[PDB]
Each structure stands twice: as structure tokens, then as C-alpha cells.
Design a protein around this ligand. Sequence first.
Ligand SMILES: [Zn+2]
Lengths: 239, 361, 576
Amino acid sequence: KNGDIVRFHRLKIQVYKKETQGITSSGFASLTFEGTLGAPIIPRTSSKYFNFTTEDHKMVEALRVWASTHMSTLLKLCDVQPMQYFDLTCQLLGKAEVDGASFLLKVWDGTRTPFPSWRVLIQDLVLEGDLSHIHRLQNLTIDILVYDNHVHVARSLKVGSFLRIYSLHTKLQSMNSENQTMLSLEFHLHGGTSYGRGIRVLPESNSDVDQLKKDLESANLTANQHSDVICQSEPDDSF
Amino acid sequence: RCEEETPSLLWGLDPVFLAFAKLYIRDILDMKESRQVPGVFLYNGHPIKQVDVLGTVIGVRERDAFYSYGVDDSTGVINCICWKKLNTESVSAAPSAARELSLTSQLKKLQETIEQKTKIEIGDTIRVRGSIRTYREEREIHATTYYKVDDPVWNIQIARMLELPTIYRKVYDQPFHSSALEKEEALSNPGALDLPSLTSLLSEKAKEFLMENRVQSFYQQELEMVESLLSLANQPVIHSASSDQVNFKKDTTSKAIHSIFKNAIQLLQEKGLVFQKDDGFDNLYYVTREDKDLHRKIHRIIQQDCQKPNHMEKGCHFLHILACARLSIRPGLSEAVLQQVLELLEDQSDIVSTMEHYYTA
Amino acid sequence: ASSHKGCLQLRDQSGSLPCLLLAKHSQPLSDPRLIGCLVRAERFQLIVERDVRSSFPSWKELSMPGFIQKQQARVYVQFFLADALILPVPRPCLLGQSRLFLLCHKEALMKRNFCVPPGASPEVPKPALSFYVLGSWLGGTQRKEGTGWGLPEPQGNDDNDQKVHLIFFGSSVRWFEFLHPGQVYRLIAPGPATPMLFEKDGSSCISRRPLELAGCASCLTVQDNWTLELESSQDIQDVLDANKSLPESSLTDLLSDNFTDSLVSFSAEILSRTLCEPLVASLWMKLGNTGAMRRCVKLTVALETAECEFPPHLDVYIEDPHLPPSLGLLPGARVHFSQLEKRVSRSHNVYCCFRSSTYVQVLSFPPETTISIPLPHIYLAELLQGGQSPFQATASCHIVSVFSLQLFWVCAYCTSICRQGKCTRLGSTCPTQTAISQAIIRLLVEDGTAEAVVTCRNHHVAAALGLCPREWASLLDFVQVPGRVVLQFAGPGAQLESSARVDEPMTMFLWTLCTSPSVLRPIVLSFELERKPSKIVPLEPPRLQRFQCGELPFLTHVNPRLRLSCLSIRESEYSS
DNA sequence: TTAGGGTTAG
Ligand SMILES: [Zn+2]
């Protein structure tokens, strides 16, 4: 996320038309940390083994303080606006495609979209996913369509993980397939990374994922939602 | 008596002002009528309007529109104006089918027994719900409802007799006023020194006055001619601000007054109190509070379960509410007026906030 | 003490029976010395817990058997140790060290998984039942003596030399249920008396610490040949002054929007249990990690505290990984939870949840016969007193007018309206064509000192309209024809408002009936304040109201009118 | 080498 704090060592600097820029050198090393004040400094790195120092962690804390009050967004699906963008974060319920410059991803947040989400005319056979955790809660699930470069990414994904869709497009819908009126919400991800359109798999150690888990704890126990699993002879608990 | 002289207009912070009180009949006369407004009376500070009293009737004067029943309860006596009611639109008695016959019959049972509760003779026990009125210098009760007390024995009278001192000591004897008294106290009252501040106070007084007069729509010039609103607006602040046109003090100041009136009504639009319908006029406004029409419409669109979805929706979402309203009526419906009406509805019990942003009716 | 589940079991020919001791009223059993013996009990209670899982369509079928799908039946006992007699089986017949410690608290028993033992055999552990405890030693280690244990070794100067985590898994789980916080226990270890036997475990020969306990340099995993003992000598009573001390909270720590009960705990007095159906209606099994659905459970503890004139009700939930509940959670029981997790819903209701941090304990079993305390009788104005005020009550008020009234015939399978079974969802979400009556009503009441609006649900309406049940059922038979009937009345004494239509003779009948004094009578109401006392609902300043009647319009400040939920309608002495 | 941050039109 923006606001993460990064440390790059043996970073080799390069130039392009006087525009200086760093590159992952031979012999390079790195660290990275969470941006929140009021929480620990937990390392996030892939380089060699390292030794942290009080000066190093105090650089992290100082950068936290700085970003927070010297330099100086969260959005549930149920709080969106008819046509805009956002860096949404969800879990992937399934993935599919119809032959073309696009690829489907189905996700959920546990909150009700103001209008019902757009629903695709998908070739259902292409969809990967489990119906158990979906059907009788489908009203809390949505669809997203990614394009071009994002196709090979989305295609390579696996269902069940957690994602953050940076600069997800929202767009208003108002019609059905037979052109009867119906207000609805669309979601898209345009090709190319300009402006920052993209996706990154989120680790299930991330505190954002803990927040999303925390949220669903209420969305199910204190759900206040009508009945489901009318086939009460089905569970048998640990059969 | 300051403590007795409770805040002006005797606000309903003290709950009793909205509910039928239970005082000794003898005390009903000892109370004052409020010198601030007629039709309201005072006891130990607490303001009273609706009164409850039960006793026995001792005299009658029968009139074409009302009866007048003298009533006693031990401590004292009074007379009570019991407005009558006719049976216009008479229900006939016919050999209707099973369901219709049963409906008519039960209705008749209810009606005849109501009559038996309504009709009355001297010496009987009588209950009356109503308010205090005075006429010919004499104080009386105009009853909202009255019915014969069907007790065969004095037990319930005994209960009331034992009770009244209890409720007195518990509730009515308590004079104190626990309000914080958060009064502005006339800071910059004769002059706001700030056209925006003057506009805010002007909007305050103007919405107050409009809600008082219950005016549903109005041309802005109609408001700009009000005496009190003018007086408030034409304080020396606006005269000094518009004084740059020294040669036209009158004209520039009157134009500034019209402009600040426009500004006040625009502030009301911003706060959703008033709005300009698609009337094609430039200074015509409709007040939301009186907009029973939009209240009815937006109540239709959910009171009858949301019509667009097939699924068994419990109500509708703020955004879809707004969108379906703009779809069925007009896109120009501002969110401010929508918020105002959504507030007023739940005030009226015409809508309920199961959560924020989703509502039912 | 059985190896698999810890639970103290009674075993004798033909089988076994679980049990639930208590040393004395409101104090737990506390010395391991008591395993093995014979206990003769004659003033005891035998429980059951029928876990039926039937599938009745309608109330009608309850008269028949042909719809139950499964059955089970917990069964166990419970008694004090002031009643039963302990007998020590005389030992059938024809070199160590020890240290004392006070214990701080207990993590709950769970099938955790574990780290690589610090600097030791890096084999990857699998899940296994385990728990650990936090405490602090008293005096140094002590040697084998025969008269108990020798003189303490020179007590350690640092806190690390005393503070200690105590880890348990494998057979030693058998020592679980004796452990209770604050006391001073004594551990014993046989074998060649030697230093280091207890003093460190930050990096060691072996100790599979759980993930949550990694990196702690004060750990200690006991050896099977060690075991614990309770300390009680008067020469140490001055340490045992923890007596009359419990992990408890201030109700403002509760009922407020911040931390998630890792901080706080509270005595309680349960009132019910049923299944958490809305979770199975949204089946997600800990985000898909638990597996199969061991359905989740809910309780309604009537919280207790000396701080407050009234107990705020405060649900508690139990989710799959902690099923089946502990023993002794039953209506009436007096229970003392510890370190729950607290979550406030977006819909704004405080609710508490189970996690490995939380462990039950029982303080008393139900009473023999259920008592009956009558709800207090009060005046509505007390709920506007400004201070704290009772939670639920009865009041001798008087109907003044009827606001709204709706009737519905609904399908018992799906949450929709249904005309006599011909369900809108019939064939789709709703298989069966069947319907039931449902009705809703809102009154306006006063009592001689305050206004209040009462919403009243289900059959109660028949008592709100004062109809005898038989005639009310007849009427409902009628309304069954339209299936849905809605009325809205512009106000007291006024005609049906715009939201309803007047043409039906039945409609006129109802309307009259809603305007007859025979309805507008006095009644004794008992009710529950519709919004519980807490911070969760913010306060607001007063609205401004402008009356219009009598002589002139009154403009005033007014608070928002009460809203109250119905519980009992009863006439008084037939007051007309 | 590439790219070397900034809205698609699906
Ligand atoms: Zn149905």
C-alpha cells in the first residue's frame, strides 16, 4: 500500500534524460515495513538475512510520523458511488472467461452493494469456484472484468486467495438483457498499468486481511439475515 | 416567583405537557392560566393542557351540539363540555351473507355498547379525557373522550382516591427544572456585523415564521415584505455594508436586503428546508416540511414494498430510494430535501431506520 | 482425570459418567492430590441435554412423531465436595526437586500447532491438544527432603528468575482442570537433583512452543514425571491473600466503543441457549478453515456488577472451534467468564464471542425450582429522569389512539407474504404451499405522566384490540381472503390516512373498532425499553415542535418520543 | 534491453 516504508541497500542508481532512478542491482538487498502508528514494526523482505538496528527502526517510526502529520482511504462495497474508481480489496470466489480481450473475477466483501452488481452472460463451464459458499448468499457477491495485460494475470490466478484491486473502475448500469430497466453497478479494470490499475495478491498475514476477517465475524453471527439451508438435515456437523 | 416562572412558552422538556394529567378536581381551579398564551395552565411550574378526572355527575344541561355535565369528586366540582357526535352514514341492518352479516352484527354490538357507555344519568360515575377551557369567566373541561365507568362497587374509586396523593408526591410536587439553560443571550442581537451571520439568523427566523404560518409555497418577495423578517434584516450591519454607494443608500441597501433574503432562502435550499419546484419561476419556493405530497410519494415507494426488485426486500437503500424517486418524479430532487423528508418521516412514524442508508416503512 | 479430554470422569464397571465438581459454593477444586480416590455422593444432581434436530413443517405436526431426524443425549452429574465423602483406596497390596509459584492466568485448551523447538529438532509439528499458563516463582528451587522439600536455593534476583510460562501437551493434559488462577501451586520433579531443572527454556534441547509463545525466554515445558500440588500452609497464607480477588471489569470498560475484551471479564447469570441459525444461513466456517459445520451457539448472560442498579443484557456467542460447550452452562447457572473477544456490529449491537483466550468456570448450579421475581411497577416518566433507570417494567397506562396496523398471511418456508400457501416463491425458493397468520400493531399510551409509543407483535395484537381469542381467530379467518390488510390512521379520532383505502365494509368495521372507547381503555402494560442502555446510540439535542390546536400554535422544544416493545397486555379490574 | 506513475470506453 501507499504509505508503506521501504529500505533499499546496494541500490544502484541510473539516469534517463537526467531523470535519476534506482534499479535492483547485483548484490542488492532490501526491507519493508507497515505504515501504521500504534502497531509493531514487522519486517517484510525477500533479501538475505539481516540485522535490524535502533537507528533503522527509528527511521521507520520517523517516516511513519512524517507521512502521518508532516506530509499528511477505506471503502466497503456498500458505500460506493455510481461511477468512479477505488482500490478495492476482496476474496476471490471464482474466475472465468469468454473468448476475448477480457477475463472475469468474482469476489465478495460481506456488505450489500447499493444496486445489485452487474451479472455476466458467462459460459458457466469456464468458471472455477465452489457453489457451497456462494449461492444462498449471492446477494453479497459481485463481478469484475479485467482487460488486456490483466488477462494473463487473472488467468494465472487461483481461487480462494485475497486480492487488492488497485484503481478498480465502477460504472452505472440501468438495463437488462431484454432491455427492461434495472439499476445496477458495473466493475471493470482497464488494460495497462497507467494511473496504477492493477492487482496484487494479499498475504493472509496482512492486518487488512485481519480487519476483513473481523468484519465477517459480525456479518454471519449477528447477520440478522433470513433463513438458509432450509435442508436442515444436511449438516450432520462432523459426520 | 422565578422558579414558578418557567422558560417562556413552557416547553415540553417536562413530559407531562403531552399526556393527560391526574390532579384533584378541587385543584383544577386553583391553577393559573398562562399569561403568555391562552389555552394552557400551570401547576407548580409543570405546564398542563390535557387533564384526566373521574367522579360522579350531578347536573345536566342538554344542547344541540354538546351536553354540559356537572361533575363532582369529593374535593370539589366543575362542569364539563361534552361535545356530541351523530351517526351520519347510517349502517343498515340486513340479512347479509355469513361474513357480511357477522361484520355488520359485530359493528352493531360495538355501536350499541358504545351508546350504553356514552349515555348517562345523574349520580353515575363518569370519566372524561380532555383539556381546560374557560368561558363567561368560568373554568371548565372540554372532553376529548368520555365514557361511563362500569364499576359495580367503589373499589376503583377507592384505588384512585388512594393513588392521587402518591402521584402528586412522586411527580407533580417536583418543581425543579433540570435544563442546562443554553441561551444565546442576545450576543450581537442588534447587529450581526457579518452578512453571512445576518443571513443565518434571518434564515432561522424565517423558517420559524414559515413553519408557524404553515405556508407551503411562497414567492421570495412575499417573504421579503414580512415586518419582523425585514426588521431583522435591515439592522445597521447591512446599511453599513451597502454604504459604499453613498449616493444611493436607500436603493443599494434595499437591493442588498433582497439579495440577503435570496441568500437566506438559498441557505434553506442547501439545508433542504425549501426548494424551487420545476415551476419555471425564478424566486418561487416550496417548503419541504409542508410538502405532504412528496412525503406521500416517497412513502408509497417503500410502504408498498420496493416495486422494482422481485426479491423479498425489507425496504430500500438510500441511494436506490433517491434514484427511484428521481426516476419516477424528477432528477432535480436535491439530496438535502430527501434527507429532510427522511428525517421527518421517522419523526412521524412513517419510516424507520433499521440501519443507516437503508430504511423501511 | 482422563487423558483424551481432561474432563474429570467417573469410571466403574460397565462404563463411565462425566462429572463437574466444586470444592464449595463459589470456589473451584484445586489440589491434584485428589485424583484416584473414591467419592461417595448422595446429594447430587443428574442432568441431560437433548440435542434433537427435527424438521417439523408447521406447528400442526408437533402433535406427531413422524418428523424427528436424529437424536443424541449428553448426560452427567454435579455436586459439591461438602456433600460427598472422599475415600482413599488403601494402596492395594497382598531424588528430585521442586519449586513454588503463583499463577497469573490460563490459556484455554485447544488443538494448537507449534514452532520448531527453539534451536532444537526442526521436525514440523502437527496440531495437538495443548495449553499453557503464566506465573511467577516464589523462593528458589528446593531439593528432595522426605519431610517435604528442603530449603530454597538462593532466590533469583531478576524477574526472569521468577516469571515463567508453563506449557502443557501430551499426557500431562491430565493435569488441566485442577488449575485455577491466583493460587500458589507447587510442582514436584523426581530424579537427580541438579540446577537448571526449571530455570530456563528460551533456547533448549527441546520444547515445541506454540506460535503465540515463540521468542519467550521464560518458557517451561513439564516432563511427564513431574506433577503439581496445591500450597496451603499458614506460613504461606500471607501470599494466598489472592483469596477474594477475581478478574473483573468496570461496566464503562464495557458498553463503550474501543478495545475488544482482551482487557475485561465479568461474572454472569445465564438465561438461555439456542442455535445460531443465521450463521448456517450464511455458512462460511471460519472463512473455510474449520471444515464441516458444528453449528454455532448463542447465550444471553444477564451481566452482573456491583456498580449498577440494573443488569444490562449482553449476548455471548460460541463458534464452531469451541464446540461442544464446556460443562455446566445452563439456564440459571452463575458463571464467571474470562477474557472474551468483544465486537460491536455495524448495525450497532454490542456482542461478545469465544476465542482461545476465553475460558469458562461455574460458580453455582441452577436452583431446584425456578423462582419468580415480578418485574417492577413504575411510571413512564422515570425513563425520562435523566439518570440511570430500570431496564424493563410494567406501568398502569391507558391506550389513547391506534397509529398503524397490518396483518399478513406468510409462507412458513420463506420470508415473504403468502396468500393461503400460493406463495410468491412457490416452486422457486419456496417448495411447499403453506401459510400462517402474522400481525403487527402500534399503540400510543399515557399513564398520567409521560407519552410513549408501544409496538406490539404477533398474537399479542389480539390482546391489544382486547378481542377474545376465539372471535379474533374468526376475524383472521376473514382477513385470510385478502391475505394482506394494512391500515394507517391520520391520527386520534381521524379517518384512515392516505396510506390505506376505506371501501371495504370490513375496513369500516376495523376503523370504527380502532376508534371505539371499548378499545381506547385502560390497560396494564409490561414492556422492555426498545434501545438498551449503552453508549452505542449517540445522544441528540431537542427537536422543535409547533402545535396547532386549542387557541394558538405552540412552538416548543421536545425530546424524541419513547419507543417501547410489548410483552404483556392485561386489563385491570374490568375498567369499562 | 524493457521502462522510466496518472485513467477506459471494455
Ligand atoms: Zn413460500
